[PDB]
Amino acid sequence: GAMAGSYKKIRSNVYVDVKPLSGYEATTCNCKKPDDDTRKGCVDDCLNRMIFAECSPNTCPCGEQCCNQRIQRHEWVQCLERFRAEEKGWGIRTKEPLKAGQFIIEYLGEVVSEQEFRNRMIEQYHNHSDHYCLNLDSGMVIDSYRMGNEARFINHSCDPNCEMQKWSVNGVYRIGLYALKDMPAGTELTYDYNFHSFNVEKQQLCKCGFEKCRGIIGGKS
Ligand SMILES: NC(=S)c1cccc(-c2cn(C3CCN(S(=O)(=O)C(F)(F)F)CC3)c3cc(CNC(=O)C4CNC4)ccc23)c1
Ligand SMILES: C[S@@+](CC[C@H](N)C(=O)[O-])C[C@H]1O[C@@H](n2cnc3c(N)ncnc32)[C@H](O)[C@@H]1O
Ligand SMILES: [Zn+2]
Ligand SMILES: [Zn+2]
Ligand SMILES: [Zn+2]
């Protein structure tokens, strides 16, 4: 059998019975390429960035200086580490400081319909002690119970320091983890499962440690 905590490490999402087409392809924005090519273009006022669409490289006026292609250019931070998080199994911490708003990592897994996921829950997952299912869009989820990347080890917090964002990238929706606030070296990354995770209808104590803790992962106040 498989070893405890085993999972298949994948490089990008695996489309099972659905593909999360966004219906949109970004075209040329109104940005101007900086003449100093060490300076980023397509910053906060990029019209594609403002609709959570990453630029398309054949049409972006900033070319290699575009900083609105973070997911497709795989611009993950390289300082993440899996560690033993007290009373929360494995967690993920950043070894170096992060800043509010920063892109951290793409969340990967198997893209499945809610129908397929419910089938997998009945047949396999119902008695697991750890769960791995992120929301995505209407009728579909990212299932990282079997396949994914190290983002699957990020724990829930009732006072999170990161969030998920859904972006249109090359015609498909993809999910990135972004910092909500500055974080010093050593910080465990967390996000709010109530906002970003699929309701797997499982009942688990929250050990996030905050005074505002809801007591249950994904629970109400
Ligand atoms: N996905 C992962 S990894 C994961 C891992 C562990 C728990 C949950 C998780 C659990 N729940 C509830 C199940 C019933 N419990 S309960 O304690 O049994 C009792 F008794 F009923 F209160 C209360 C908590 C959730 C509720 C929501 C609500 N969000 C949504 O539905 C989306 C937001 N847009 C709509 C989101 C995630 C969860 C998800
Ligand atoms: C997406 S996995 C996170 C990685 C997991 N800790 C592990 O060891 O592989 C979600 C599971 O981690 C545990 N977990 C996540 N956040 C937690 C928290 N705040 N308190 C206690 N357990 C938590 C729960 O068992 C949950 O089903
Ligand atoms: Zn732009
Ligand atoms: Zn651009
Ligand atoms: Zn909590």
Residue nearest to atom 3 of ligand 2 (CA): 153
Interior/surface letters 113-123, b for 16+ CB within 10 angstroms, e for the rest: ebebbeebbee
Regarding the beta carbon of 193 and ligand 2, being less than 6 Å apart is answered no
- Ligand 3 centroid, distance to 29 Cα (angstroms): 5
Distances (CA, A) of 36 to 32, 33, 39, 42, 64: 12, 9, 6, 14, 12
Residue the block writes with tokens 């966004």: 22
- Ligand 3 centroid, distance to 170 Cα (angstroms): 15
Distances (CA, A) of 162 to 4, 55, 67, 190: 27, 23, 20, 6
Among 81, 112, 74, smallest CA distance to 186 is for 81
Measure the CA dihedral 65/71/76/81, to 10°.
Answer: 170
Are the CB atoms for 163 and 178 separated by under 8 Å?
Answer: yes
Q: Map residue 116 onto helix, strand or coil.
A: helix
Both tokens of 32, joined, read: 């101007």
* Ligand 1 lining (C-beta closer than 6 Å): 131-133, 193-194, 197-204, 216-219
Lateral strand order in the sheet of 140-143: 14-15, 110-113, 140-143, 133-137
Interrupted backbone of the chain, residues before each interruption (C–N > 2.5 Å): none
- Residues with Cβ within 8 Å of 189's Cβ and at least 6 positions away in sequence, in order, are 80, 91, 92, 93, 94, 104, 154, 155, 161, 162, 177, 183
Regarding the beta carbon of 119 and ligand 2, being less than 6 Å apart is answered no
Cα Rg, the chain, nearest whole Å = 18
Q: CA 208, CA 87: separation in Å to the nearest integer?
A: 9
Residue the block writes with tokens 């100093």: 36
Closest ligand 2 atom to the C-alpha of 206? 20
Residue the block writes with tokens 């200086």: 65
Closest ligand 1 atom to the C-alpha of 201? 13
Q: What's the reported resolution, in angstroms, to a tenth?
A: 1.7
Q: CA 15, CA 109: separation in Å to the nearest integer?
A: 9
Q: Map residue 138 onto helix, strand or coil.
A: coil
**Residue among 81, 82, 84, 88 whose CB has most ligand 2 atoms within 8 A, to mutate:** 88
Q: CA 65, CA 73: separation in Å to the nearest integer?
A: 12
Q: Method used for this model?
A: X-ray
Q: Interior CA angle at 166 toward 196 and 90, to 5°?
A: 45
* 133 φ/ψ angles, rounded to the nearest 5 degrees: -145, 110
Are the CB atoms for 88 and 209 separated by under 8 Å?
Answer: no
Task: Report the DSSP pairing between strands 155-156 and 162-169.
Answer: unpaired
What single letter denotes the amino acid at residue 126? H
